[PDB]
Amino acid sequence: KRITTPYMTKYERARVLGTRALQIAMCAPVMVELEGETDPLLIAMKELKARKIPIIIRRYLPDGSYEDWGVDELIISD
Amino acid sequence: HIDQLKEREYNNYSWQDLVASGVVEYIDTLEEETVMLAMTPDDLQEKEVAYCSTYTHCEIHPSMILGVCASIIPFPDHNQSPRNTYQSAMGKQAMGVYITNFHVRMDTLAHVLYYPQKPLVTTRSMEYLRFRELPAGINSIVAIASYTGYNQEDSVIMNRSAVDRGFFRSVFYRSYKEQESKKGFDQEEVFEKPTRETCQGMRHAIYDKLDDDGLIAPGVRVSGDDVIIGKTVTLPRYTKRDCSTFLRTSETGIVDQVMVTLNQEGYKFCKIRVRSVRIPQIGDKFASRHGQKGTCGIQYRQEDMPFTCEGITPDIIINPHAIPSRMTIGHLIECLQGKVSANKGEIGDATPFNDAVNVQKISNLLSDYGYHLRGNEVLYNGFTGRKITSQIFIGPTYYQRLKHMVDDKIHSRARGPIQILNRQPMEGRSRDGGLRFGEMERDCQIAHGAAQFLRERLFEASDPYQ
Amino acid sequence: MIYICGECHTENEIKSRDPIRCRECGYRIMYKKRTKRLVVFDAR
Amino acid sequence: SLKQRLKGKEGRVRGNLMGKRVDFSARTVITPDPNLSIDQVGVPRSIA
Amino acid sequence: MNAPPAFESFLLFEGEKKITINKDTKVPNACLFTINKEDHTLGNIIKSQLLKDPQVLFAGYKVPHPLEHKIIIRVQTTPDYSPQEAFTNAITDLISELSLLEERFRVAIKDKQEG
Amino acid sequence: DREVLRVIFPTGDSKVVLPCNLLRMIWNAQKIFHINPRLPSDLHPIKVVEGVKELSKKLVIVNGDDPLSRQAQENATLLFNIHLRSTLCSRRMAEEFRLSGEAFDWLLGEIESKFNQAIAHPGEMVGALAAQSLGEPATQMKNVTLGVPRLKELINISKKPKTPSLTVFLLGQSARDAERA
Amino acid sequence: PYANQPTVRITELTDENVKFIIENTDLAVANSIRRVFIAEVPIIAIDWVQIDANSSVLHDEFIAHRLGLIPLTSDDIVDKLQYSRDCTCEEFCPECSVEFTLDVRCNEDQTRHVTSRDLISNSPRVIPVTSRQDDILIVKLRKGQELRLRAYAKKGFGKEHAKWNPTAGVAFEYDPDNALRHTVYPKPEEWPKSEYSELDEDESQAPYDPNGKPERFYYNVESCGSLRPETIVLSALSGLKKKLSDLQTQLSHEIQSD
Amino acid sequence: KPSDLHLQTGYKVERHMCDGDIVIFNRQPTLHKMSMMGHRVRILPWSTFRLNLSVTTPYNADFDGDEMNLHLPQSLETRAEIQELAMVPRMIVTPQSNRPVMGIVQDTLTAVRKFTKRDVFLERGEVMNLLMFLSTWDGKVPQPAILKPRPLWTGKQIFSLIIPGHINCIRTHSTHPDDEDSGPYKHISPGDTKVVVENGELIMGILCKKSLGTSAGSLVHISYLEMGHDITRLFYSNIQTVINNWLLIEGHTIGIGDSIADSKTYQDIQNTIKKAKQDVIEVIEKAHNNELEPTPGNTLRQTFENQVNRILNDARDKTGSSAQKSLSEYNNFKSMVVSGAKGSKINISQVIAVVGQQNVEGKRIPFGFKHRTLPHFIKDDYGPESRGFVENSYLAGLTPTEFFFHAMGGREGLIDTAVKTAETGYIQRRLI
Amino acid sequence: QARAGVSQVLNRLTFASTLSHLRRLNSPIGRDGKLAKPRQLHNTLWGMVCPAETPEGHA
Amino acid sequence: DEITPDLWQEACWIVISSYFDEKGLVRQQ
Amino acid sequence: MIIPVRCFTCGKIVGNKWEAYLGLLQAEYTEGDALDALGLKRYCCRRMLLAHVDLIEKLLNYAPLE
Amino acid sequence: LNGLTDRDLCELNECPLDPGGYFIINGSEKVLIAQEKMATNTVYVFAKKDSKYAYTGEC
Amino acid sequence: LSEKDVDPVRTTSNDIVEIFTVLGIEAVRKALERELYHVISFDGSYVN
RNA sequence: GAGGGAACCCACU
Ligand SMILES: [Mg+2]
Ligand SMILES: [Zn+2]
Ligand SMILES: [Zn+2]
Ligand SMILES: [Zn+2]
- Planar angle of CA F122, F128, F132, nearest 5 degrees: 130
Which residue is catalytic, options B17, B43, B154, B164? B154
Plot region of H313 (φ>0 → left; ψ -120 to 50 → alpha; else → beta): alpha
Q: How far is the CA of B417 from the C1' of N2 (A)?
A: 8
Q: Are F19 and F118 in contact (CB under 8 A)?
A: yes
Contact with chain B for residue H107, Cβ under 8 A: yes
Give the whole-angstrom CA distance, residue L1 versus residue L21. 12
* Domains defined for chain K, CATH in brackets: 1-66 (1.10.10.60)
A–M touching, 3+ CB–CB pairs within 8 Å = no
Contacts of J10 (CB under 8 A, 6+ apart): none
User: CA C18, C22, C27: angle at the middle one, nearest 5?
Assistant: 115
Give distance CA H301 / C1' N4 (Å).
66
Minimum CA–CA partner of H331 in chain G: G186
Q: Is B212 a catalytic residue?
A: no
Cβ neighbours for B381, distance < 8 A, ≥ 6 positions apart = B306, B387, B388, G31, H248, H249
Q: Is B230:B191 a contact under the CB 8 Å cutoff?
A: yes
Physical contact, J and C (3 or more Cβ pairs within 8 A): no
Q: Compute the distance between CA of residue A77 and CA of residue E58 in angstroms, rounded to an integer.
A: 40
d(CA G141, CA G247): 51
CB B279 within 8 A of CB B163: yes
- Let me know how long chain L is: 59
Kind of pairing between the strands at H22-26 and H67-71? antiparallel
- Which of I17, I51, I52 lies nearest to residue B92, judging by beta carbons? I17
Check: CB of residue E93 under 8 Å from CB of residue G246. Answer: no
CB atoms within 10 A of CB C29: 18
Nearest-angstrom CA–CA distance, G250 and E35: 10
Q: How far apart are CA H155 and CA F180, in angstroms?
A: 65
Report yes or no: G203 and G160 within 8 Å, Cβ to Cβ.
no
CB of H48 within 8 A of CB of B283?
A: yes
Q: Ligand 1 mean position to A18 CA, how many Å?
A: 36
Task: Measure in Å the smallest separation between the Cα of L13 and chain B Cα atoms.
Answer: 6
Rounded Cα–Cα distance for residues D28 and B153 (Å): 17
Report d(CA G118, CA G106) in Å as an integer: 13
- Strand N: which nucleotides have any atom within 7 A of a protein Cβ? 1-5, 7-13
- Judged by a CB distance cut-off of 8 A, whether residue E52 touches chain B is no
The answer to whether the bond into H29 is cis (omega within 30° of 0) is: yes
- CA pair distance H55, H135, nearest whole angstrom: 19
What's the rounded Cα separation, in Å, for the pair B383 and B306? 8
Number of continuous H segments (helices) and E segments (strands) in chain C: 0, 4
Region label for E29, one of left (φ > 0), alpha (ψ between -120 and 50) or beta (otherwise): left
Amino acid of residue B376: N
Q: For each of the domains in chain E, give its residue range(s) and CATH number, in order of start.
A: 1-115 (3.30.1360.10)
Q: Strand N footprint at Cβ < 7 Å?
A: B 89-90, 92-93, 201-205, 225, 293, 404, 416-417, 419-420, 426; H 28, 62, 64-67; I 4-5, 8-9, 11, 26, 55-57, 59
One-letter-per-residue 3-state SS of chain B: CHHHHCCHHHHCCCHHHHHHCCCCCCCCHHHHCCCCEECCCCCCCCCCCCCCCCCCEECCCHHHHCCCCCCCCCCHHHECHHHHHHHHHHCCCECCECCCCCCCCCCCEEEEECCCECCCEECHHHHCCCCCCCCCCEEEEEEEECCCCCCCCCEEEEEHHHHHCCCCCEEEEEEEEEECCCCCCCCCEEECCCCCCCEECCCCCCCCCECCCCEECCCCEECCCCEEECEEEECCCCCEEECCEECCCCCCEEEEEEEEEECCCCCEEEEEEEEEEECCCCCCEEEECCCCEEEEEEEECCCCCCECCCCCCCCEEECHHHCCCCCEHHHHHHHHHHHHHHHHCCCEECCCCCCCCCHHHHHHHHHCCCCCCCCEECCECCCCCCECCCCEEEEEEEEEEECCCHHHCCEEECCCCECCCCCCECCCHHHCCCEEECHHHHHHHHHHCCHHHHHHHHHHCCCCCC
Of G33, G16, G37, G70, the residue nearest G157 (C-alpha): G37
- Smallest Cα distance from I40 to chain L, Å: 15
Best CA proximity match to F41, nearest among F107, F130, F120, F85 = F107
K10 a known binding residue?
A: yes
Q: Domain of H221: which CATH number?
A: 1.10.274.100
What DSSP string describes F113-150? HHHHTTSPPTT--HHHHHHHHHHHHHHT------SHHH
Chain I adjacent subunits, 3+ CB pairs under 8 A = B, H, J, L
Reduced 3-state DSSP string for chain H: CHHHCCCCCCCCCCCCCCCCCEEEEECCCCCCHHHEEEEEEEECCCCCEEECCHHHCCCCCCCCCCEEEEECCCCHHHHHHHHHHCECHHHCECCCCCCECCCCCCHHHHHHHHHCCCCCEECHHHHHHHHHCCCCCCCCCCCCCECCCCCEEEHHHHHHHHCCCCCCEEEECCCCCCCCCCCCCCCCCCCCCEEEEECCEEEECCCCHHHHCCCCCCHHHHHHHHHHHHHHHHHHHHHHHHHHHHHHHHCCECCHHHCCCCHHHHHHHHHHHHHHHHHHHHHHHHHHCCCCCCCCCCCHHHHHHHHHHHHHHHHHHHHHHHHHHHCCCCCHHHHHHHCCCCCCHHHHHHHHCCCEECCECCECCCCCCCCCCCCCCCCCCCCCCCCCEECCCCCCCCCHHHHHHHHHHHHHHHHHHHHHHHHHHHHHHHHC
Question: Rounded to the nearest 5 degrees, what angle is found at the Cα of H132, between the Cα atoms of H126 and H133?
Answer: 105
Of J25, B108, B93, residue with least CA distance to I14:
B93
Return d(Cα H363, Cα H387) in angstroms, integer.
9
Domain ranges of chain C: 1-44
Q: To the nearest whole angstrom, how far is the Cα of E76 from the nearest Cα of chain G?
A: 16
Which residue has its C-alpha nearest to nucleotide N11's C1'? B93
Q: Delineate the domains of chain G, giving CATH numbers in brackets.
A: 1-42+163-258 (3.30.1360.10), 43-162 (2.170.120.12)
CA of C5 to the centre of ligand 2 (A): 4
CA G15 to chain CA centroid, nearest Å: 14
Nearest CA in chain B to K3: B115
Give the CA-to-C1' distance from B259 to N4 in angstroms. 28
Between the two ends of chain G, the Cα-to-Cα distance in Å is: 25
Helix (H) or strand (E) holding G19: strand G17-23
Residue K23 gets which letter from DSSP?
H
* Partner residue opposite B389 with nearest CB, options G31, G60, G183: G183
Neighbour subunits, B (≥3 Cβ pairs < 8 A): A, C, D, E, F, G, H, I, J, K, L
Judged by CB atoms closer than 8 Å, whether chains meet at B409 and H67 is answered as yes
Q: Could you give the C-alpha distances from L39 to F69, L42, L59, in angstroms and in order?
A: 76, 7, 9
Supply the range of the domain harboring residue H116: 106-250
Q: How far apart are CA B11 and CA B21, in angstroms?
A: 15
The domain made up of C1-44 is a member of CATH 2.20.28.30: yes
Q: Does M38 touch chain F (CB under 8 A)?
A: yes
The one-character DSSP state at D21 is E
Comparing CA positions, the residue from A47, H369, M46, H410 lying closest to residue B79 is H410
**Nearest bound ligand to the CA of residue C27:** 2
| Experimental technique | cryo-EM
The three-state secondary structure class of K33 is helix
Q: Which residues of chain G make contact with H250, given a CB cutoff of 8 A?
A: none
Strand nucleotide closest to residue I58 (CA to C1'): N11
From the number of C-beta atoms within 10 Å of its C-beta (0-12, 13-18, 19+), residue G38 rates as buried
Spell D13-29 as b/e; 16+ CB within 10 A means b. ebbbebbbbbbbbbbbb
How many Å from the CA of I9 to C1' of N10?
Answer: 8
CA F46 to chain centre: 26
CATH class given for the domain over A1-78: alpha beta
Residue D25: its H or E element: strand D25-32
G106 is in an annotated binding site: no
- Cβ–Cβ contact K34 with B under 8 A: yes
Distance G188 CA to N10 C1' (A): 53
Q: Can you state the percent helix, strand and coil of chain G, rounding each to 5?
A: 25, 30, 45
Whether H27 has a binding-site annotation, put simply, is yes
Q: Which ligand is nearest to the CA of G87?
A: 3
Q: From B218, which residue of chain C is nearest by alpha-carbon distance?
A: C34
> With contact defined as beta carbons under 8 Å apart, do B371 and B259 qualify?
no
**Cβ contact K62–B166 (<8 Å):** no
Cβ H33–F132 below 8 Å, yes or no? yes
F vs A contact (3+ beta-carbon pairs below 8 A): yes
Cβ burial, residue B212 (10 Å; 0-12/13-18/19+):
exposed
Q: Do residues H270 and H294 lie in contact, with contact meaning Cβ atoms separated by under 8 Å? A: no
